[PDB]
Amino acid sequence: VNQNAQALNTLVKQLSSNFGAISSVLNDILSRLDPPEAEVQIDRLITGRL
Amino acid sequence: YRVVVLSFELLHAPATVCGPKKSTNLVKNKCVNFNFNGLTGTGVLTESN
Numbered sequence A: 001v002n003q004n005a006q007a008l009n010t011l012v013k014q015l016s017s018n019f020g021a022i023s024s025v026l027n028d029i030l031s032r033l034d035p036p037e038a039e040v041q042i043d044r045l046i047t048g049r050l
Numbered sequence B: 001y002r003v004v005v006l007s008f009e010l011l012h013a014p015a016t017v018c019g020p021k022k023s024t025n026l027v028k029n030k031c032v033n034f035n036f037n038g039l040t041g042t043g044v045l046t047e048s049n
Helices: A002-013 A026-032 A035-049
Strands: B031-034 B041-044
Touching: A026 A035
Parallel strands: none
Antiparallel strands: B031 B041
16 A cells, blocks of 8 residues: 555656756646747656656 | 837746736636736636635
8 A cells, every 4th residue: 555655646746847948837837938949848847757 | 229128027926017908807617717917727716725
């Protein structure tokens, strides 16, 4: 039960990590950058989260 | 050439400078798209305890 819960809690914590993007919050990048160039930031998070 | 650099604090605190969007009255107890000073999200708004 402890190993199941620590692995779930780590999957949740890694949503907050940057992976080298300008914010970890997807909705920050969706407010602050226009699509032609925002896609180069968001790819960091898609790859990092995957 | 005259040069200006527009530095922003994107670090979180209460709102002090803001872009020209009008505000609106707030819904509670329903699922809504919501923003507070750039805090964009989607969900149900309710009173805290």
